[PDB]
Each structure stands twice: as structure tokens, then as C-alpha cells.
Enzyme design. Structure first.
Site, PDB file in Angstrom:
ATOM      1  N   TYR A  78       0.824  -1.209   0.000  1.00 59.13           N
ATOM      2  CA  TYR A  78       0.000   0.000   0.000  1.00 59.13           C
ATOM      3  C   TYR A  78       0.859   1.260   0.000  1.00 59.13           C
ATOM      4  O   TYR A  78       1.865   1.328   0.679  1.00 59.13           O
ATOM      5  CB  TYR A  78      -0.923  -0.008   1.213  1.00 59.13           C
ATOM      6  CG  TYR A  78      -2.254  -0.646   0.915  1.00 59.13           C
ATOM      7  CD1 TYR A  78      -2.333  -1.977   0.524  1.00 59.13           C
ATOM      8  CD2 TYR A  78      -3.431   0.098   1.012  1.00 59.13           C
ATOM      9  CE1 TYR A  78      -3.566  -2.563   0.237  1.00 59.13           C
ATOM     10  CE2 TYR A  78      -4.655  -0.462   0.740  1.00 59.13           C
ATOM     11  CZ  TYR A  78      -4.721  -1.798   0.359  1.00 59.13           C
ATOM     12  OH  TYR A  78      -5.950  -2.329   0.077  1.00 59.13           O
TER      13      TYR A  78
ATOM     14  N   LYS B 150      -0.478  -0.696  -4.545  1.00 57.82           N
ATOM     15  CA  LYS B 150      -1.824  -0.194  -4.678  1.00 57.82           C
ATOM     16  C   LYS B 150      -1.767   1.270  -4.243  1.00 57.82           C
ATOM     17  O   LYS B 150      -1.463   1.570  -3.074  1.00 57.82           O
ATOM     18  CB  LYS B 150      -2.772  -0.957  -3.765  1.00 57.82           C
ATOM     19  CG  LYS B 150      -4.215  -0.540  -3.896  1.00 57.82           C
ATOM     20  CD  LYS B 150      -5.086  -1.592  -3.227  1.00 57.82           C
ATOM     21  CE  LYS B 150      -6.535  -1.186  -3.168  1.00 57.82           C
ATOM     22  NZ  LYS B 150      -6.848  -0.404  -1.956  1.00 57.82           N
TER      23      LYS B 150
ATOM     24  N   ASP C 122     -11.017   6.081  -7.289  1.00 58.01           N
ATOM     25  CA  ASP C 122     -12.049   5.983  -8.312  1.00 58.01           C
ATOM     26  C   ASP C 122     -12.400   7.337  -8.949  1.00 58.01           C
ATOM     27  O   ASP C 122     -12.647   7.408 -10.152  1.00 58.01           O
ATOM     28  CB  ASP C 122     -13.346   5.388  -7.751  1.00 58.01           C
ATOM     29  CG  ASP C 122     -13.144   4.117  -6.930  1.00 58.01           C
ATOM     30  OD1 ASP C 122     -12.090   3.952  -6.287  1.00 58.01           O
ATOM     31  OD2 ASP C 122     -14.117   3.318  -6.867  1.00 58.01           O
TER      32      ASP C 122
ATOM     33  N   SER D  17     -13.909   0.508  -4.769  1.00 57.19           N
ATOM     34  CA  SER D  17     -15.217   0.058  -4.288  1.00 57.19           C
ATOM     35  C   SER D  17     -16.352   0.328  -5.272  1.00 57.19           C
ATOM     36  O   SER D  17     -17.343  -0.397  -5.293  1.00 57.19           O
ATOM     37  CB  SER D  17     -15.525   0.776  -2.973  1.00 57.19           C
ATOM     38  OG  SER D  17     -15.548   2.155  -3.258  1.00 57.19           O
TER      39      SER D  17
HETATM   40 CL   LIG Z   1     -10.690  -1.672  -0.470  1.00 56.80          CL
END
Ligand SMILES: [Cl-]
Ligand SMILES: [Cl-]
Ligand SMILES: [Cl-]
Ligand SMILES: [Cl-]
Ligand SMILES: [Cl-]
Ligand SMILES: [Cl-]
Ligand SMILES: [Cl-]
Ligand SMILES: [Cl-]
Lengths: 288, 290, 289, 290
Positions: free
Chosen positions: C137, C160, C186, C203
Site C-alpha cells: 500500500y 496499490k 475511483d 469500491s
Molecule cells: Cl478496499
């Protein structure tokens, strides 16, 4: 109504002598260098990069005059005219109109924590001074509440210099008929992607070629070039600011024979050799 | 162990009177000084700071305020003049004037708007120091406790105005620089400052509630620990109620309510309707200032 | 070669019954829904969006098995396996390898303020557990350079990237062209693309992969105007979506589409039946029909 | 007023002993309790909080620690158990166990990792309250003073463990909620907490320096203003020196140095070389703890 606001607008440096006087001949040389060598689309004067807070009222009026005269209508001109002195700001608005500036801008009232109502009233006052388009500075509350400033008489849009690209996207969605001049040099291609067409920035003073390369690659749909040229441009920006930004820009101009002078106190005054070597390094690595 | 005696006690950050039309209200300056010395019973006055709207003053306005304050004071209380701005040459002239007018100290805000480096800030204070032999208070700059010492050691610097809400950093400075003066400038934490050794307090809220602030100091000195708590709760209720409207507008309105020709704020501060700000001044006065 | 990491990776929700039990059959229905209805390129399981801190160790293993079984090798699978329990994390890395996951990821050690050395050591320990690619991360607080010390750990193939800092992202893309960055904001999909992101974890792709894919296709087709317009619609959708709890909304939307996606676990807010249903219908009608 | 006298004084946030290889060290829990009661002479113990590595404990470990502490303490000092986590059903069982074991209070951290709403947080505390009739201390949640009062009003909630660096919010809470108990949990601001009415202190640093913290309290009660300052500067020197290596590793090493089988931290906390952390323990001990 906004074609003339397309492209690259260096936030012009304001030449001072070593002993800190406004260097009037230098102002003309910088304008000629921007127009003729950097080949810019417009010039953004007396903003942060122009050391505007270190300028007297008289100095500001003189810069506005010198720039309009040297430009002689060749490129688009925008003058940043805001300060905490509202009466002076109104006078600079009228002067911008008289000199045929294409637009004015005004910084958010600074130092104190001014309310939204105070900020709104500030822009309202400046609006009544002259019928000339105004770009307000982006103020991080809501998209809707920002619209209240955008609706003020004569306001055509905003100079957007925040790193928040989500807020930028939301503004472009909500106000398609306002002009957003994108002022975060390190995110030029990201601004293009969300619909920015005009860019104001300190770094365009000496590398309009590198920035224009990004715009051209983007318009040509060369995705990989957009990336590559961005990484290079942003390498340049970080290298450039490893010394004071305005001192570096000025030193690079002087290296190119432009009488761009020096920063004013309390900006750091570098030793001669140190800053020259910096300008040489940047010019060799990025500016050929 | 008992240094800086003249800097003990309460120093309102004085408001600067303007007429409704924005002119410096010279007679008002004197009235404000007399109100602070005689009615508020202050130990000193801190002029042309943020609360004094200093960024809205011309260079000539600043000189006039400094002269009018020194004249009205007539040596009664300690005077400190905030003289800094981004105009270094003007700041040097103001330092010399402060010295000629027998100010007890000057102070200068951190260079603002731009992100100036430590070296730029250090050089700014160095230049101001050479202008006149008069004690300087620097502004606290959050830079470790140690790095801040490099600013504290500049010629003529006797200490710092400490306006941050970080009480641990304040405790650390008091431990590390027992020879320097820290004027504590967070009015809502007066008693916390006292606890860690502050003896002098600069604040906007002491312009009209010096009595309430002194009540906390006197309780603390008298070992009345429960009253320190109660009087602090009342005082902070007061601060929060006061700033329900613009600070300087409210201070000036309360003064005007008490017969002091304190005038008005300059643009771009909000100009309230006269009835609206009068009710606010009465609200604060009846609740806290009787 | 990261071709299998290109495209949309919903951060999968984890179905629970109204009573808080793992809903095994719902796990498989969600996987089928993502693969067959949303047409996703991959699935990112047991992340924040999958309520992973609300899962027991045994639940995590079962979700991992159920997803690999339901997937039937169709799409790329990534399992987020991190927690402060290092021995369990190591066991989950071994399981992901056994189940032939394409990658694992692990969140930054949380709650406490862990040092860089502790964070580095955590990733080193996980790396030795199993030979499977790891996505670390992104952590802001930390220079582009010293983040490279994490990126060079054994089996780490990249990161990520879920921060809102697009400059740090651009800098990573500049410095580490050999590493894989999966873009996880997003609301900035098109910005990510512009700077070379090709894989997206999020998500919101659980129920609007179509809307997100529209942006990607417009971008690839050089329809710069549509990239803008479709982004404005997509971000309207995101903000409308999260006017109620994110996972409650995603699950309610799936339930509306006949998917046994179940409910959130405590302490997430349990909405009244009609309120969340109305929300799901509103989102579906406005953006997803 | 409530009689909260048993919550006055110092409550170390107890470390949880683990073996080098990470097993709960059951015998060590009892030795740490005795050290705190008999050598540190504390007023109470706060168990399984952040300093107790609670997130690194299994549910079964948590129950075992709670049992072992209650056994070792044998009612000598006040006991508070932090029992919160994202597992609500486990938290309720822990609340019931705390009551069974005659703990004086429980506390529960704010739901963490995710950004939970006020309503989610309110409902979380509501659910824990139904489990057992035992006083609850909620964790302060940085939120208006009035909004926090809604949490304070939940059945069985007697107050809050206040760990923020914001002493203004603390002052506001003390003003608004005089009959709620606020346990002050910012070790570096002990004297500032006392000054605003705190009487009970929870903190990691009291595990090994209860003497130094008590010295501040005694000086404060004695109205020795100068000593409060000096002893605070010393204490905060100690805190900063202590945390120049990992906090829990350092506390455990200091205990081990004093012959207490306090064990080690669990992963992913850094494991130091034994000689390195031992010298750190000696440095702290010799400088501050003799
Ligand atoms: Cl997530
Ligand atoms: Cl600028
Ligand atoms: Cl220079
Ligand atoms: Cl002030
Ligand atoms: Cl007013
Ligand atoms: Cl729900
Ligand atoms: Cl703790
Ligand atoms: Cl250790």
C-alpha cells in the site's frame, strides 16, 4: 469568448535592481523575452511570482504600464491586482481597463482568516470599479458556495492553483460556461484531461517549450509522449526549485541575456557563483 | 529567577481606531490608550499587531499610531510595538522610531504570505536587529525547540511572542530557554501558560476584559486552584461569545458602548449593521463585563 | 508483463447474513455478478471495502477459497491479506499461493504509529511466506526514494496507490517504470490513465464497472470530450452513492439486482429496510439502468 | 456529586508481557501487577489499552489478562479494563467478564481504522452498555462539546478517558460536565491537566516513573508553583528520552532491569538487540528513576 485565454501564461517575474528598486527597463526586456523567445500565448503579471506584495502602489501601476507598452497588443495580458488595500485595488482595476488588459485577477484576502461573506464582498467591491473580466482565486468550501463568487458581476471564472484535482473536476462539471485557468504547473496534463485550456504558472517563464510539448502531445493523442514529457517537465520543476524559485527564474533569464534583475528582500539573495551555476545547470539539462 | 519585570501582566493587543470612512482616527487612538490604562488597568499595551489591523495601515499611519500611543501613555505602562511586514526598509525605520519614542520593546511577525525558509526568516530578523538598540520579541515559528533557539540568539532578541495552541512546545521552550522572555499569546489558555511559567500575556481579548483575565492571575497567585478553574471557564465562555461576531468589530463596539471613540474596522473586514453590533456589544458587556 | 492487471478490479464486498454470519453462498453470487454482469477484469478481495477487519481468521480463509472456486479461473484475483497479526498474514499468503491468486496485497500496519523500519520489516516477513507477487500500500508518511526501499522487497511487484496526491503518483510512475501501480482513487480514474495507470482497484466498480469502463474506452479512443463528460457523470454517481454508507449501498444495490450480497457487520450502521432500498433504486435508476 | 475518589491519582496503562516468541506470558502479568502496586505505588491500573498491545491480543488472551490482573491485584488498587475493538460481540463478553471480576470500570476505544459516523459510534457505545452494569469511560473523540455529551449520557457512562493534545477542548468538557469523570491521558501535560481539574491520570509513562509524576501532583497540591514547573521539565525530558526507542520495548526493558519478568513486545513492533535496549533501560533508570 475565451479563445484568447488558451495556452501558456507565465506568471511574470518583476525585475528589481540589486539594491531593490523596480527595474523598469528590465520589465520591458522580460516582456519581449516572453513574447519573442518563449513564444507564450499571454502574460500573467504582478501575481505571487511577480513579488507583488513587495511592490509599492506606484510600482504596481508602473509595471502595468510598462507591460502594456512593451507587449503592444501581441499577447493576451492578465493583471493580478488584489491586496488588502481595496481602494488601491479598485484603482488598479480601472488602470487595467484603461491599458486594455484582457482580464484582471485578485488573490483571496490574505493573512487573516476572512469569512466567505467578507471574500464575497471584496470581489463585489472590485467588480464595481471597471467593466473588465475578473478571474477570482480558487478558495478551498463547497462547489456550490464557490459558484456564488463566480456569479459576481464581471467574474468570468477562476484561476485554479490548488492541488485538489477532484475539486477541479467538480468545478468543470458544474460551471462549463466559466473560464478556469489552471495554475498547477506540475499537473498540466491532468488539467488538460479535465478540460483546462489555459495555464498560468511560474515555470513557463523559462520553459514554455517543455510545457507546450505536453500540450501538443496531448492534442495529438500521443498518450505515451504526454507521460514522458510530463515526467521530464516535473523533473525540471523540482530541479528548478532546489534554489529559490524567483531567484532561479531571474538567473536563468540573465543567463539568456535578459535584464531580469533580482528578487527583493526578504527573499534570499544568493552568492553570484552559486546561482549562476544553478541557472547553467537548469538551462543545459532542460532548456536547449 | 524574576527576570523581565516590566513585561509582567496583561498586554492587550490594541485595536487601531478608524473612522467609518476608513481614515486613521487619531483622537480615537488616545482614547483607547486611556481606556486601557485607566479603566482596564493593564500592565502594558501591544500595538499595531494583527488585532491592530496593521496590514491595513500605511507606513505613515503606523508612525502616527506609534507616536499617539507614546504620547497618550506618557510612560504609565509598558509599550511594545509590532513593526514587522514584508517591507524590510520600512520596518527598520519603525524600529528606530520605536527607540526614539522609548518603546520598551518591538516585535515583528514572521514574514508571511510566501513560504519563507528558515534562513530567510533568520536574515529578516538580523536586518531588523541592526536598525536600533531596542529589545525584540520574535514570533513563534512551528522547526524544533533547538532550531528556534537560532532565532532567539539574534542580536537584541530577548524572547518570543508565543501564540500557538501547542502547550507542549511552550513547555519545551520554557525548559530550554529560561533566560529568554516568552509572552504568552493564547488567551484561552492563560492559566495553562501561568502553570508552565508565563508571566506576561499579550491578547486581543484583554482589550475589554482585563478584569476577568486578572481575576485568573490573582487566583493563581493566591493559590486558589478551584477559582483558577471556575474563572477560566467563565473567561473562555466570554472568548467564544465575543468571537460570535468579528473580533475587532466586537472589541471596537464594546469600547464605543463604554464611551470610547474606538471607531471601526477597515476594509475588507465585515462592517456590521450598527444595531446588530451594538446588541452584540451589550450582550458581551451585560454577561461578562459588569 | 502485467497484462493480466489491466482494467477494472472491484474491491469486493463480503456478504454477511442479517445476523452477522459469513454468507458463503452470497460470496459466490457476488463473484458471479462481478464477472458476468459487471464484466470486470479482476477482483480485489478482503480489502477495506470487504470489511476485512470484521472477519475472523477462518472467515478470511473461507472467502479466499469461495472466491477462487466461484471465479473458476475467469478473472485476475488479488487478495488483501494484511493485518497486525503477522503469523495469520503469513498463512493467508500461503493460502493465496495454494489457490493460485495472481497477487496479494497488505495494508500498512495500522492503529499505532509504526516506524518505517517496522513497516519494512512487516513486508519482509510476509515476503518470505510464499512466492506470490505482492502489492504494497502506498504510504505518504515518505519520499519517492525511500518508498523505493519497500518496492524492492522480495516478491514486491509494485503498489496499490490510493492517495489523492496525483503528483506523488506521477513521480512514482516516473521513477519506477518497472513496477506495477494499481490506481485506487475511483474519482480520478481518467487522471490515473493520463499518467499511465492501466489497472484500477475500487469500491465503486462493484456496481458501475460499465460507467468506469466507458471512461477507459473513451480515453483509449482519443475522445477527450467524452472522457470529461463520462467522468463528470461517474463522479456524480460516486457522490450520490456515498450519501448513505458505502458498503450498505453497494450491498443494497446488488440485492436489488437479485444478488444475495447480504449485509454489513457491526459496527457499520444497519439502515431501515425502505430507506436503503429507496437509495439502491435511486442509484440504479439514475446511473445503472 | 458522585464519589469518584477511587479514580484519583496515577493509573499506569499496563504493558502486557509476552515471551520472546510471542506467547502471552501469564506469570509475567502477575509480576508486572505487583511491581505497579508495590514498587510504583500506583493508585490504579489501566489494562489492555494501546500500551497493553490490545490489538495484538487474541480474544482468549484478553480474558486471560483480565483474570490474571484481578487475581494478582486482589483488590489492592483500582482496576480499569479497556475492552473495545471492532468485534462488538467479543467486547460485550469482555464487559461481562470485567463485571464478574469486579473491575471498577471499563473503557472502550473509538471504533478505529474506518471513518465511523457519530451515529455508528453512539450505537457502538449503546450496545456495550447493555452488556453489563459497570461504569464506562468513553474515549474522547475530536466533535463539538455538546455532541460529545450525547455519548457521555449513554447508560453506565460515567465520563471519558481524555487523551488529546487539545487542552482547550479539555477545559470546555470540564466546564460543561462537572459531574462526569475525566481521566487525563496526556502524560506530558499532567500539571496542565491538574490546573483545569483533572484528578486521575492514565498513562504509559507511569509504568516506571510514578514517583516523578507523583512529585508533580504533590508539588501542585502544595502550591509550589516553581517545583511544578521544574518537575514537569524533568518529567517531559524523561518522556522524550524514554521514547527515543520504542515505548513498549523501553517500558518492558526497564521493568526487566528491575527484575520484573515483563517480557517482550509482539510483532510488528521492533525487536531491539538485548544489549541496545538494556543500555537504554539503564540510561533512563539512572537519569530519572533512582
Ligand atoms: Cl478496499
Ligand atoms: Cl503567480
Ligand atoms: Cl539571487
Ligand atoms: Cl495581535
Ligand atoms: Cl462593525
Ligand atoms: Cl443496511
Ligand atoms: Cl494506553
Ligand atoms: Cl525489544
Amino acid at each position: 469568448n475565451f479563445d484568447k485565454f488558451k495556452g501558456l501564461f507565465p506568471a511574470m517575474v518583476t525585475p528589481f535592481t540589486k539594491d531593490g528598486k523596480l527595474h523598469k527597463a528590465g520589465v520591458k526586456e522580460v516582456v519581449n523575452f516572453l513574447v519573442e523567445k518563449q513564444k507564450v500565448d499571454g502574460i500573467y503579471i504582478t501575481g505571487s511570482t511577480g513579488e507583488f506584495l513587495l511592490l509599492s502602489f506606484e510600482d504596481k501601476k508602473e509595471v502595468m504600464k510598462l507591460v502594456a507598452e512593451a507587449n503592444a497588443g501581441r499577447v493576451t495580458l492578465i493583471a493580478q491586482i488584489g491586496s488588502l488595500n481595496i481602494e488601491e485595488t479598485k484603482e488598479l482595476a480601472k488602470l487595467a481597463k484603461e491599458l486594455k488588459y484582457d482580464a484582471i485577477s485578485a488573490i483571496t484576502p490574505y493573512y487573516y482568516n476572512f469569512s466567505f461573506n467578507e471574500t464575497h464582498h471584496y470581489y463585489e467591491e472590485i467588480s464595481k470599479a471597471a467593466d473588465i473580466p475578473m478571474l477570482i482565486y480558487y478558495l478551498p468550501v463547497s462547489t456550490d458556495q464557490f459558484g456564488k463568487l463566480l456569479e459576481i458581476k464581471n467574474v468570468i471564472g477562476s484561476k485554479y492553483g490548488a492541488t485538489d484535482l477532484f475539486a477541479f473536476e467538480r468545478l468543470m462539471s458544474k460551471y462549463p460556461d466559466k473560464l478556469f485557468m489552471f495554475a498547477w504547473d506540475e499537473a498540466l496534463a491532468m488539467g488538460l484531461t479535465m478540460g483546462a485550456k489555459g495555464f498560468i504558472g511560474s515555470t513557463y517563464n523559462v520553459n514554455a517549450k517543455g510545457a507546450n510539448a505536453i500540450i501538443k502531445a496531448w492534442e495529438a493523442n500521443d498518450k505515451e509522449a504526454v507521460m514522458k514529457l510530463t515526467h521530464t517537465y516535473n523533473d525540471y520543476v523540482l530541479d528548478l526549485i532546489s534554489k529559490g524559485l524567483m531567484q532561479s527564474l531571474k538567473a536563468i533569464m540573465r543567463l539568456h541575456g535578459v535584464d531580469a534583475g533580482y528578487t527583493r528582500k526578504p527573499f534570499w539573495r544568493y552568492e553570484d557563483e552559486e546561482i549562476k551555476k544553478h541557472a547553467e545547470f537548469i538551462t543545459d539539462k532542460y532548456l536547449k
